[PDB]
């Protein structure tokens, strides 16, 4: 780990108290940048398409949505592509609301896993795609390293991990109010490397305002 956190219990407890007050809505998941949900989803669809479907590329039977919240990414990115999707999130309230939010698309959701990711083992060799969006910043370096390694073991043959998150331009940003660390490129790539993953592709998110931290998508295996 680049940064050790002494007090991981207090760190993760504060994130829980934060998300208890987050509305279980698409706007709530977006943190009142609801206007960025559409360009986010449109870019995610195209990036997914690059790495899914075809010889050697990832299959389309099963995906895992990590830090799913109520399932915004499942609803508009994953469920239109995969035969079945599973959600994992630490907030039971978000997972329960996902059943209402997903409407008919929720009929293809096989499981709602209520776990914190640093305490979660993605089922062995089960997934064609594991999607990790806007939650990696909540894991400490040690825990993200470990979680990425376990995600790799959750992949079927030719499967991939897609990581989509804020990447600070320079250095990192520790946010004590929601227990998150926004990493820079060098830190994140180092952790990706040390987990045993290789970058199959990367893409900067377009259509976001300049006053936002950049967002990047990475395809890994």
């Amino acid at each position: 780990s680049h940064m050790v956190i002494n007090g991981e219990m207090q760190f993760y407890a504060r994130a829980k108290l934060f998300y208890q007050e987050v509305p279980a809505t698409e706007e709530g998941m977006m943190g009142n940048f609801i206007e960025l949900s559409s360009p986010d989803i449109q870019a995610s669809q195209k990036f997914l398409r690059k790495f899914v479907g075809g010889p050697g590329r990832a299959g389309t039977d099963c995906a895992l949505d990590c830090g799913s919240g109520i399932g915004r990414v499942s609803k508009h990115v994953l469920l239109p592509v995969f035969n079945s999707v599973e959600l994992v999130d630490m907030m039971e309230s978000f997972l329960l609301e996902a059943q209402n939010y997903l409407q008919v698309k929720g009929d293809k959701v096989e499981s709602y896993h209520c776990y914190s990711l640093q305490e979660f083992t993605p089922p062995f060799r089960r997934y064609d795609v594991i999607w990790i969006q806007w939650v990696s910043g909540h894991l400490t370096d040690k825990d993200l390293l470990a979680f990425l390694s376990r995600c790799r073991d959750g992949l079927k043959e030719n499967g991939i991990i897609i990581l989509k998150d804020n990447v600070a331009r320079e250095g990192c940003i520790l946010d004590l109010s929601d227990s998150s660390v926004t990493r820079d490129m060098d830190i994140l790539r180092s952790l990706i490397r040390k987990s045993g993953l290789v970058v199959l592709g990367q893409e900067k998110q377009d259509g976001f305002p300049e006053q936002c931290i950049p967002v990047w998508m990475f395809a890994l295996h």
């Binding site: 998941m29 977006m30 943190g31 940048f33 960025l36 986010d40 976001f208 006053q211 931290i213």
Partner: peptide
């Protein structure tokens, strides 16, 4: 989600 510059 998205976050403002610091």
């Amino acid at each position: 989600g998205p976050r403002r510059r610091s």
